[PDB]
Design a protein around this ligand. Structure first.
Ligand SMILES: [Zn+2]
Length: 195
């Protein structure tokens, strides 16, 4: 099967937000609204904002999962390549196979789905800190888009779902991701190609 990627704000008006990091040669993570695409370096911090119109119930969680964007590959589990799954860079919590990690949250849980074998990482949905209007989750992508035997130059999407304590859908948003050496340059190139 294939997880849904349908945008769904739901009852709480759930949607993502991204910083405006620009396209300098030195940028490590940058988001293109025109492409709905995040460009980031390997294992670098990717700040993703969570916005809601009203506060979800205690026990609400936020899950991230990657799928291949092309229909020819959607059924294939997105995982780390044969090299990176063995490079012993575990944070002590993420399984070495998982492409997406959450940085600096000890309540992050990593799921290997017993049925679909797909990987995801889930955290409790926290209210914004005082003086803030949203909450930010920091993600890491632990393989290059180009890694042989892994993503192998195939584009992926990250699907973010807002879930109740049972795992039922409350909200959904998504964005394409390219993990690459020079995010600023590749964003500029792809945005030019678009126009
Ligand atoms: Zn890799």
């Amino acid at each position: 099967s294939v997880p849904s990627q349908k945008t769904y704000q739901g009852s709480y008006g759930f949607r993502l937000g991204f910083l405006h990091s620009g396209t300098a040669k030195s940028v490590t993570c940058t988001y293109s609204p025109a492409l709905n695409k995040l460009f980031c370096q390997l294992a670098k911090t990717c700040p993703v904002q969570l916005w809601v119109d009203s506060t979800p119930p205690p026990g609400t969680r936020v899950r991230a999962m990657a799928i291949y964007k092309q229909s020819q590959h959607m059924t294939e589990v997105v995982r780390r390549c044969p090299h990176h799954e063995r490079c012993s860079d575990s944070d002590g919590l993420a399984p070495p196979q998982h492409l997406i990690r959450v940085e600096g949250n000890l309540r992050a849980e990593y799921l290997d789905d017993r049925n679909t074998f797909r990987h995801s990482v889930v955290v409790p949905c926290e209210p914004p800190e005082v003086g803030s209007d949203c909450t930010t989750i920091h993600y890491n992508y632990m393989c290059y888009s180009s890694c042989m035997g892994g993503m192998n130059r195939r584009p992926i999407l990250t699907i973010i779902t807002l879930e109740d304590s049972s795992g039922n859908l409350l909200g959904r948003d998504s964005f394409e991701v390219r993990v690459c050496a020079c995010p600023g340059r590749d964003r500029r190139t792809e945005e030019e190609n678009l126009r």
